[PDB]
Design a protein around this ligand. Sequence first.
Ligand code: HEM
Ligand code: HEM
Ligand SMILES: N=C(NCCC[C@H](N)CN(O)CCN)N[N+](=O)[O-]
Ligand SMILES: N=C(NCCC[C@H](N)CN(O)CCN)N[N+](=O)[O-]
Ligand SMILES: C[C@H](O)[C@H](O)[C@H]1CNc2nc(N)[nH]c(=O)c2N1
Ligand SMILES: C[C@H](O)[C@H](O)[C@H]1CNc2nc(N)[nH]c(=O)c2N1
Ligand SMILES: [Zn+2]
Lengths: 402, 403
Amino acid sequence: KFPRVKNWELGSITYDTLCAQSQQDGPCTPRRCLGSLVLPRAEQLLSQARDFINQYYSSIKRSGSQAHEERLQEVEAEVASTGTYHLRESELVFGAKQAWRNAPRCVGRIQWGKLQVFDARDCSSAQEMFTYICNHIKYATNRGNLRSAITVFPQRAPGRGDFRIWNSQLVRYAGYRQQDGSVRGDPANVEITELCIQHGWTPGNGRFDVLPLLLQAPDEAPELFVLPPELVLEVPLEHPTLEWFAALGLRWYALPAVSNMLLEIGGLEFSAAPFSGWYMSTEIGTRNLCDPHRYNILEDVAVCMDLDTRTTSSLWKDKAAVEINLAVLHSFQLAKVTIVDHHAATVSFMKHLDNEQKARGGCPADWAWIVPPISGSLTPVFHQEMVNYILSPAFRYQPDPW
Amino acid sequence: GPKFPRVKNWELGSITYDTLCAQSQQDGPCTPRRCLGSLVLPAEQLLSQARDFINQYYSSIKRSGSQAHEERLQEVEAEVASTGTYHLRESELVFGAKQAWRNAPRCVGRIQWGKLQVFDARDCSSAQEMFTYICNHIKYATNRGNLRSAITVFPQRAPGRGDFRIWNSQLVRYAGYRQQDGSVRGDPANVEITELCIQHGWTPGNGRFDVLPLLLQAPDEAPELFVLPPELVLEVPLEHPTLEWFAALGLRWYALPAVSNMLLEIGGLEFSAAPFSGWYMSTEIGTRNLCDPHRYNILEDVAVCMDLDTRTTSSLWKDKAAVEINLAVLHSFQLAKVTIVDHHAATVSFMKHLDNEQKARGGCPADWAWIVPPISGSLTPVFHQEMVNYILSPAFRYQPDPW
Ligand code: HEM
Ligand code: HEM
Ligand SMILES: N=C(NCCC[C@H](N)CN(O)CCN)N[N+](=O)[O-]
Ligand SMILES: N=C(NCCC[C@H](N)CN(O)CCN)N[N+](=O)[O-]
Ligand SMILES: C[C@H](O)[C@H](O)[C@H]1CNc2nc(N)[nH]c(=O)c2N1
Ligand SMILES: C[C@H](O)[C@H](O)[C@H]1CNc2nc(N)[nH]c(=O)c2N1
Ligand SMILES: [Zn+2]
């Protein structure tokens, strides 16, 4: 019933009792494990609402109190007559922090308690969404001293369209499909780039053109907004000892801000609730720059390093990858922009695991996502068994609005 | 769409559906409530398992429903009927052993599955004879550096009688000597088997790479100790292609990886002693065996020799040192003409295996956490391939230590 969890480097054992609190099914069954797959293939609401309110009052050490009992009545009254309800700002703040804390694929959760929550539920137009987004970016960027934040737009409502941010992140580089099939820029963003153009954006022709935002108010066509360049901090990439690296003209933006995930709290759903923390260097240096379906610069860098790209056995791919990740760290450090390397991040996650074991009896974690894309076993998390399950409040994927 | 798991490759955008998982008859550790995919170790019945295996065998030779098939099924039911168990024919053992390998979710080398050399040692009746069979396996498999995959199958577990067992986890292992200061000289992973060898009369050495003797156990007898003739255990001294000082570290590793404590299950029959061997994927040695903190842990030593800043994580000193250590392993095995496969070549071959199996059986059970190499994960194609994990039989399974 309760899984035994072992760390093979230290030989230590724990038991995950928190998983018993999961109310939502994942993709696995006793016949087959689908743990490596990326995407999944009124009384109910009232049930989730009560559970959430209970979590909230327990967090402020006031369960059973009068305020607790009265709040539960309010929620019951609102759902019974309207089919839905609304969260108080303090609950929204607690809810967003818990969603982060519960996110199995996030290795930066040691920071979960420090999140600036912007209540944007009084938003009635895409124009207003844009203003809130600009303020989020300014605050979060903070001149390179990044601060974790989330801006929460109006919840979903029955028979009414959702407030949505079409872009997957607030800052993304365009991907222009070229005549000969290739892509200029970021291949992951070809679809959104095209949508922007289709909606009147005058495209650029570079490899790092910041995309405009396509923001959508309920039941309206999305609207295009160009981000003020001075609000988008970027870091030109250079290498500490390889002088020619800068000549590659590579760069990446400072702020990672997921904008297409749904935040679920107490049964309520927030379809637009962009959040941001700071990058772990491998996200940029390894995946964004070296993925074959992304900027795919490994071969170029290897040739500049004059490595033997003739055979795999020369480990040219491994050598180039390391220097690229080193360039990212060096460059962010030089530009004085917050970033965390994969060793420091995983070491902090092990502390988080321990903190959560004591606090809640476990921590849902997705091993395939927590272990870094390079040097996996050189990090502590590789040797740590993990149990994955869904807790609520939660961040979850949702269909693209188009 | 299809009511089977949909599997996507994110690098290529391609999709397949796994229908082979429908054939699984054993539950894994996961439930809809929680995934335990990252955990390392998470007559009526015999007849059904036996019948299923016979059906698999006849299906494989394209004779399902034939007179021979029905007669073999009859024969197995009667043998189990009067004796409680049954025995496999030679070709059934060969088919079952290859299928067990083919079915192994944690093995990235499965493209080679059809080439296994199956040594039938089911006539073995003593520990001394087990040793002879094992030495022949080592000689055949090593083939002076041009390694050949092989498995030697000893007698199956029998009702009442004791089990045939090889106590060591691999045929070649380096001793791990517990020190006064509490540290370990040699391989920390082998501290327990090393002590057991000593408790059984082995006179211990005092080096970092002392090859351990084998503790072989015949039915209902105490284990017997046998030391492998040095001439038979091929080793490779490690040197680096450019860093001249690497050779001075005195590191080395043996050529033959030969798992000896896994149980081979075929049609319900259990072969407690069936050592198998292929060849190493370089990261097993260069990354795990040499750099794991709980193994040889040589990362800091090598980083210091490379004059890296081991004071801060940000210098990526662990990453740089690990890459050079893996390169030294590949370079040295290549120099010594001993078969080895780097993690890029191996994962590329595994992607081909997945495509072959998609066509041949409708899927391939695979454990993502084990298939993706310990270094440079996303630089290999398997990192971007979703995988379905499930248990198929014949199979190789873990079994408790005999002591
Ligand atoms: C403070 C610094 C933070 C760091 C260093 C960090 C790091 C990471 C990393 C490396 C991943 C995997 C990303 C990928 O491979 O695409 C991730 C995923 C995630 N993080 Fe964090 N994180 C941080 C802050 C946040 C914040 C502020 C939230 C939400 C309030 C959050 C929510 C999540 C979620 C939900 C995912 C999964 C996204 C997906 O499935 O695509 N993270 N994080
Ligand atoms: C021909 C070359 C082969 C290569 C390169 C290869 C490579 C690998 C690798 C890299 C692993 C993971 C090992 C670890 O991380 O400890 C593995 C595991 C495994 N392989 Fe293969 N393998 C080969 C041949 C074989 C053969 C001949 C068999 C059996 C007939 C086999 C059965 C298995 C099994 C059952 C495991 C899992 C062992 C465990 O769970 O500890 N492999 N293989
Ligand atoms: N450091 C962070 N990295 C997350 C960015 C990409 C992630 N795949 C989200 N995403 O695109 C989800 C949509 N499929 N987060 N952060 O600090 O806020
Ligand atoms: N390349 C190979 N590597 C096998 C390494 C040991 C593995 N951990 C099994 N093992 O010792 C199981 C014990 N718990 N195999 N081979 O080629 O035959
Ligand atoms: C197929 C496989 O699940 C997929 O490539 C996963 C693996 N681990 C990952 N881990 C992180 N952090 N981010 C990712 O995008 C992925 N991709
Ligand atoms: C805890 C975690 O499951 C464990 O460290 C696994 C991860 N992946 C692995 N993969 C391979 N090939 N071999 C291993 O020993 C491991 N160890
Ligand atoms: Zn699972």
